[PDB]
Amino acid sequence: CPGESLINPGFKSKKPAGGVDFD
Amino acid sequence: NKAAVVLCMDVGFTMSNSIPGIESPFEQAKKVITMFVQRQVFAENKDEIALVLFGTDGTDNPLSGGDQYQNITVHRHLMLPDFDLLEDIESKIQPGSQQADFLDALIVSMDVIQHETIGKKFEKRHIEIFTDLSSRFSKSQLDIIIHSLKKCDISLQFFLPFSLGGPFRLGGHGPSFPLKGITEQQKEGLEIVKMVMISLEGEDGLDEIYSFSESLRKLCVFKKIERHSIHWPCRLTIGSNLSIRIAAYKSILQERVKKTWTVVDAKTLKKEDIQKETVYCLNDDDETEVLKEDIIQGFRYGSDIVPFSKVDEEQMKYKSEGKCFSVLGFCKSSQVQRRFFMGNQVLKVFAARDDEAAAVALSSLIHALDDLDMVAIVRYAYDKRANPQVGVAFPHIKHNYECLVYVQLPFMEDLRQYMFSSLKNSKKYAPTEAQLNAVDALIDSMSLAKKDEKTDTLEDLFPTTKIPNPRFQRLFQCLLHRALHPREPLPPIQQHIWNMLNPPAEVTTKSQIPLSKIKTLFPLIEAKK
Amino acid sequence: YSGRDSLIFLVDASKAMFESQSEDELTPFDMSIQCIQSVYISKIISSDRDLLAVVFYGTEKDKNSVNFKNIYVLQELDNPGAKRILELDQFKGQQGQKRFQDMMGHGSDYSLSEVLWVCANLFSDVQFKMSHKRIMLFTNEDNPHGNDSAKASRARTKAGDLRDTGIFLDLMHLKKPGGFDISLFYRDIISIAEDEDLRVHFEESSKLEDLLRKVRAKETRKRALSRLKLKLNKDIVISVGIYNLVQKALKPPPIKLYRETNEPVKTKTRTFNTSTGGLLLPSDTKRSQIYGSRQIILEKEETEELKRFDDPGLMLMGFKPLVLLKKHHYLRPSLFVYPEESLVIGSSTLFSALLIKCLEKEVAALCRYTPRRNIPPYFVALVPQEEELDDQKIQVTPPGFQLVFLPFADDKRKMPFTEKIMATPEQVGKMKAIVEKLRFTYRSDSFENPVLQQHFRNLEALALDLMEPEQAVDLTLPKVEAMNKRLGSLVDEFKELVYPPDY
DNA sequence: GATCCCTCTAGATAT
DNA sequence: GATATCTAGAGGGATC
């Protein structure tokens, strides 16, 4: 399954926060 | 801080006329006044309440000298309301057989305000009049009344059996007392009241003329004595060189009962004889008492436990810079979904009081956000000991004020990533065209908004946001019933409470046939357990 | 619950893993050790109620209960812990390699079928009900098992019947000297949809970066808050489930424990009379409230009864257009409503029809909400929610109704009247320029709770006896320097336009 | 029947 | 310096 976390199966992987990035 | 409210309620024989199927105006006014006094007593407010009755057989007021201001009695002077007043309202007050002028009664009540306010500090002097206006009155003191009310800074409200503008239902969302039995005397009284309200305020007093049925489902009685919340001073900082002095108030904050149910002994009814304790014992068998100071803080780390003392946790704790309201950046309003709002409060951000420069700066920010259809993502921290939050500050422009509304936004950890099966793509859960048409008819029939003709404004037929919380009124009723009749069971929920909580009878009647179609087209069967 | 999660870490102990291609990189053995350390930390933070194990093959000693050769079961399937983390940290890189070589052998022959049998029986030993059976295999060669076709075929049959059982065998492309040389044994020994790893993979790492990316979250599983009944009237009733798609994550509460022996201490609270000292039954107490000089006495059942209005569920008051739902009328976080066919049949069909028609007509179902017994009701609006799929065809917004609470009359606070001071169009334009300069794209997961992050770092440092807790970076802070550089003279111009030179 | 989660009610202590 | 928020003790549901 694409976009699936390898640590906790059944839940999508969490993208890193990043914060505020000005365009 | 403290207000002086005088309830000038009619007692005359006219309001005792009970039209079949409709509760009498005397009973409706009694219910409204009981609603007001119940909150004023059980909320422990410091406002002092006086009760003036006009239309009674007897006379007792400091204005009677023989054939003037007759049939008006001052039942209660300005003092803290109590269960004595509540019992007087419930049972000891009886309808009279005489008639009195609702303007002479206003004179008497203003006299009470003026000659009992001295020696005490009152920020507000409110007064409410409950009458049906179906009595002959002398309109010769209007100028004096208006001048005295304006000079003494005394508010006004009026409550009538009919609203200003199926079966009648007290407290419901529908037509009030029918607009066909109003006599010419009532018409003259109504136009006099309209003129008085106009002269006192301007245009918005026509909104301050209520009916008992609609006042039972509104907080309008407490409108002129409600206390405004305290402000939260801070600065709205954009970058490190642009600061705007602001003041924030809580718009929506769920109200809960302040008084707590004290646990007392079933015999002596005293909390002193009953006291709790905590017991610390080992989780294994042979529970042994553990001394209070022989326990240290700990934490779970997987299958193990680690000690983490209070002082060590304080030393290693995340330390905030302090109170702040700082903009992290601006984003489109469409990117901040309403379904992601967090927290348990809503903040409205105004400029600092008596600060024209701050007002101009905040208005410029609000107008820029509104024109660009953008919102501000801000960092909010109530104090240096408060956990910082990230939220959205979207503009809110009205005809009399402008502000930024702050609602807390979620963090990464707050979101829940749940998978739900698709409904549109489902094959076994696909409604047919007949079912879709039946649901369409149901939606059309159960509409709670009416589109006004010749105007593009939608009128709400069930504005629940103006309905007070029924739990407080139910609790007050139960407490008063127990206080007055200590040896009787609690009374049932009041019919007008149920009526304001129920949808309009027009909607209920209209929703009959479509609901039958839904029942006959949707085979709902309960699964056997 | 739907079962727990089980993971087995399979690490090769061949001599070829102990060497490094270059000298500025990290050797495969301790790099995989760091991988497992990161997985343990992530599981402890997020999903501590899972099972993790580490087994080594290609060694001299053995400790597996079923007693096969050249296989060391270092850890059994059990919950992750700081003790296990430190035990595996005992083999970390420098001097870790020497301790590994001193405590277990390396370079010895091994059998893949033997290893898979060990993994299978190790899974079978634990009695817990598990949703997933996954093993991660760490190696960077395939030569030793390619010499004997008989044992290669035996290992292939072992993978086959493990796949039939439901063992989700993963492959980790580890740092190889001259390439892993896939498509001989490890391509068809694993369970894959297709040849995604069709390249030779000269690179040392494939998914190790996201294997090392730690997960600092509570990671809660799906569970319906309440299985209520949506009542159109007294006769048409459907069953729905209530879920919280957003819930404010809390710092885990501290546990009280004995000082020197360090075991949890349970707490029991008892109420007794001061005079007699004996225990009091719940019928021996009454609830009291005092107003002024009058005391009101109620039973506990009476106090619970006065809060009772309606039976639990949702009663459909009517349908109201979405334009009448004011955005600034937020009271408490919204809930999600989804149909439940396990209670009433046809609930899904009626829910789908209602959702379709509400979305078409842009109306919200106004309902009276009673979460449970003896609780006052609130008015809620069932805002229709359409399913939203991104470019990857994964679900980001579930279909259903968004149960949004509506405030009551006394939930709203009035505010002091202010003077509506208007802003000139030039000032509005200057702030427009400022806002456009500070524009950015917002996502719901763009920020992390600094308090929770710092608490997790502190807990990890204290449990692992680190020299100092590594400080979390507060992403919820204004980048003041970047903002000033981006703005420039716009702020000064706005201040000149608005603020008089006294304020 | 235990456990975990989630509101609700109640107590305290800083800013 | 009243206040609000943070933190710390009692019940109902879901799922083992």
Short mmCIF file of N, CA and C in Angstrom, two decimals, chain B residues 63-128:
data_model
loop_
_atom_site.label_atom_id
_atom_site.label_comp_id
_atom_site.label_asym_id
_atom_site.label_seq_id
_atom_site.Cartn_x
_atom_site.Cartn_y
_atom_site.Cartn_z
N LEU B 63 -46.19 57.54 47.24
CA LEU B 63 -46.70 58.60 46.39
C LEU B 63 -48.20 58.80 46.52
N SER B 64 -48.89 58.01 47.34
CA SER B 64 -50.34 58.10 47.46
C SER B 64 -50.72 59.19 48.46
N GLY B 65 -51.59 60.09 48.02
CA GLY B 65 -52.09 61.15 48.88
C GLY B 65 -53.59 61.31 48.76
N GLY B 66 -54.22 60.37 48.06
CA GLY B 66 -55.66 60.39 47.89
C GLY B 66 -56.10 60.69 46.47
N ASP B 67 -56.46 59.63 45.73
CA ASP B 67 -56.91 59.71 44.34
C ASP B 67 -55.77 60.07 43.39
N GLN B 68 -54.57 59.57 43.67
CA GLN B 68 -53.51 59.55 42.67
C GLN B 68 -52.60 58.37 42.97
N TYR B 69 -52.13 57.71 41.90
CA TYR B 69 -51.29 56.52 42.01
C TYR B 69 -51.95 55.46 42.89
N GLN B 70 -53.26 55.29 42.71
CA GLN B 70 -53.99 54.30 43.48
C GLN B 70 -53.83 52.91 42.86
N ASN B 71 -54.13 51.89 43.67
CA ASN B 71 -54.08 50.49 43.25
C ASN B 71 -52.68 50.07 42.81
N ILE B 72 -51.66 50.71 43.36
CA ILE B 72 -50.27 50.36 43.12
C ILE B 72 -49.60 50.11 44.46
N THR B 73 -48.96 48.96 44.61
CA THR B 73 -48.31 48.59 45.85
C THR B 73 -46.87 48.16 45.58
N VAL B 74 -45.98 48.53 46.50
CA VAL B 74 -44.56 48.15 46.41
C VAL B 74 -44.41 46.88 47.25
N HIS B 75 -44.47 45.73 46.57
CA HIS B 75 -44.40 44.46 47.28
C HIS B 75 -43.03 44.24 47.90
N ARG B 76 -41.96 44.60 47.19
CA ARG B 76 -40.60 44.36 47.65
C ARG B 76 -39.74 45.56 47.30
N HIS B 77 -38.90 45.98 48.25
CA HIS B 77 -37.99 47.09 48.02
C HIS B 77 -36.68 46.57 47.43
N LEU B 78 -35.72 47.47 47.22
CA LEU B 78 -34.42 47.09 46.68
C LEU B 78 -33.63 46.35 47.75
N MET B 79 -33.43 45.05 47.54
CA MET B 79 -32.58 44.23 48.39
C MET B 79 -32.25 42.96 47.62
N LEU B 80 -31.33 42.18 48.17
CA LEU B 80 -30.92 40.95 47.51
C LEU B 80 -32.10 39.99 47.41
N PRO B 81 -32.37 39.43 46.23
CA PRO B 81 -33.47 38.48 46.10
C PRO B 81 -33.19 37.21 46.89
N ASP B 82 -34.26 36.56 47.34
CA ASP B 82 -34.11 35.39 48.19
C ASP B 82 -35.33 34.49 48.05
N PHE B 83 -35.29 33.37 48.78
CA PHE B 83 -36.37 32.40 48.71
C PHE B 83 -37.67 32.96 49.25
N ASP B 84 -37.61 33.96 50.13
CA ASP B 84 -38.83 34.63 50.55
C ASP B 84 -39.52 35.31 49.37
N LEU B 85 -38.74 36.04 48.56
CA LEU B 85 -39.29 36.65 47.36
C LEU B 85 -39.78 35.59 46.38
N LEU B 86 -39.03 34.50 46.23
CA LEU B 86 -39.45 33.45 45.30
C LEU B 86 -40.78 32.83 45.73
N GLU B 87 -40.94 32.57 47.03
CA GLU B 87 -42.20 32.02 47.53
C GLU B 87 -43.34 33.03 47.38
N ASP B 88 -43.06 34.31 47.63
CA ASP B 88 -44.08 35.34 47.43
C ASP B 88 -44.56 35.35 45.98
N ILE B 89 -43.61 35.27 45.04
CA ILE B 89 -43.97 35.25 43.63
C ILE B 89 -44.77 34.00 43.29
N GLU B 90 -44.35 32.85 43.82
CA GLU B 90 -45.00 31.60 43.45
C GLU B 90 -46.42 31.51 43.99
N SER B 91 -46.64 31.87 45.25
CA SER B 91 -47.95 31.57 45.82
C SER B 91 -48.64 32.76 46.46
N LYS B 92 -47.91 33.65 47.13
CA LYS B 92 -48.56 34.66 47.95
C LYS B 92 -49.08 35.84 47.13
N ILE B 93 -48.69 35.96 45.87
CA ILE B 93 -49.20 37.02 45.01
C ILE B 93 -50.42 36.51 44.26
N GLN B 94 -51.53 37.24 44.38
CA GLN B 94 -52.79 36.85 43.76
C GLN B 94 -53.27 37.95 42.82
N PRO B 95 -53.97 37.59 41.74
CA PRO B 95 -54.50 38.61 40.83
C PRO B 95 -55.53 39.49 41.52
N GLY B 96 -55.53 40.76 41.13
CA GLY B 96 -56.44 41.74 41.69
C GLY B 96 -57.69 41.92 40.85
N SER B 97 -58.52 42.86 41.28
CA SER B 97 -59.76 43.19 40.60
C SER B 97 -59.83 44.64 40.14
N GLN B 98 -58.84 45.46 40.48
CA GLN B 98 -58.82 46.86 40.10
C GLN B 98 -57.97 47.07 38.85
N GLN B 99 -57.91 48.32 38.41
CA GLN B 99 -57.10 48.71 37.26
C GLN B 99 -56.25 49.91 37.63
N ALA B 100 -55.04 49.95 37.09
CA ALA B 100 -54.10 51.02 37.37
C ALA B 100 -53.42 51.44 36.07
N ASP B 101 -52.84 52.64 36.10
CA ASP B 101 -52.13 53.18 34.95
C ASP B 101 -50.71 52.64 34.93
N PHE B 102 -50.30 52.10 33.78
CA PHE B 102 -48.97 51.53 33.64
C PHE B 102 -47.92 52.64 33.60
N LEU B 103 -48.36 53.88 33.42
CA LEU B 103 -47.50 55.05 33.53
C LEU B 103 -47.38 55.55 34.96
N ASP B 104 -48.47 55.54 35.73
CA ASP B 104 -48.38 55.84 37.15
C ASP B 104 -47.52 54.80 37.86
N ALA B 105 -47.65 53.53 37.46
CA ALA B 105 -46.78 52.49 38.01
C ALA B 105 -45.32 52.75 37.66
N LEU B 106 -45.06 53.23 36.44
CA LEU B 106 -43.70 53.59 36.07
C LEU B 106 -43.18 54.74 36.92
N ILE B 107 -44.05 55.72 37.21
CA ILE B 107 -43.68 56.81 38.11
C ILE B 107 -43.29 56.26 39.48
N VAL B 108 -44.11 55.35 40.01
CA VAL B 108 -43.84 54.78 41.33
C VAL B 108 -42.52 54.02 41.33
N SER B 109 -42.27 53.24 40.28
CA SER B 109 -41.05 52.45 40.22
C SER B 109 -39.81 53.33 40.08
N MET B 110 -39.91 54.40 39.28
CA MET B 110 -38.80 55.35 39.19
C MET B 110 -38.56 56.04 40.52
N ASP B 111 -39.64 56.35 41.25
CA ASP B 111 -39.49 56.91 42.59
C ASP B 111 -38.76 55.93 43.50
N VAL B 112 -39.10 54.65 43.41
CA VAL B 112 -38.41 53.63 44.20
C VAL B 112 -36.93 53.61 43.87
N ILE B 113 -36.60 53.62 42.57
CA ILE B 113 -35.20 53.63 42.16
C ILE B 113 -34.48 54.84 42.73
N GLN B 114 -35.07 56.03 42.56
CA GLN B 114 -34.39 57.26 42.97
C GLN B 114 -34.21 57.33 44.48
N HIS B 115 -35.22 56.95 45.25
CA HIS B 115 -35.18 57.12 46.70
C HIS B 115 -34.70 55.89 47.46
N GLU B 116 -34.34 54.81 46.77
CA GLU B 116 -33.66 53.70 47.42
C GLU B 116 -32.27 53.44 46.85
N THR B 117 -31.89 54.11 45.76
CA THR B 117 -30.53 54.01 45.25
C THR B 117 -29.54 54.83 46.07
N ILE B 118 -29.99 55.91 46.71
CA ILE B 118 -29.09 56.76 47.48
C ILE B 118 -28.46 55.96 48.61
N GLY B 119 -27.20 56.27 48.90
CA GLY B 119 -26.44 55.55 49.90
C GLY B 119 -25.79 54.28 49.42
N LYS B 120 -26.00 53.90 48.16
CA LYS B 120 -25.42 52.69 47.59
C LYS B 120 -24.91 52.99 46.19
N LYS B 121 -23.94 52.19 45.75
CA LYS B 121 -23.31 52.37 44.45
C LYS B 121 -23.89 51.37 43.46
N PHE B 122 -24.54 51.88 42.41
CA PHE B 122 -25.13 51.06 41.37
C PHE B 122 -24.61 51.53 40.02
N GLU B 123 -24.00 50.61 39.26
CA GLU B 123 -23.54 50.97 37.92
C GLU B 123 -24.69 51.03 36.93
N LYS B 124 -25.75 50.26 37.16
CA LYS B 124 -26.90 50.24 36.28
C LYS B 124 -28.19 50.31 37.09
N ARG B 125 -29.19 50.97 36.52
CA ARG B 125 -30.53 51.09 37.11
C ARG B 125 -31.52 50.61 36.06
N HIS B 126 -31.79 49.32 36.04
CA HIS B 126 -32.71 48.73 35.07
C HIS B 126 -34.11 48.64 35.66
N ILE B 127 -35.08 48.47 34.76
CA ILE B 127 -36.49 48.35 35.14
C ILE B 127 -37.22 47.60 34.03
N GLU B 128 -38.13 46.71 34.42
CA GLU B 128 -38.89 45.91 33.47
C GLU B 128 -40.37 46.00 33.82
#
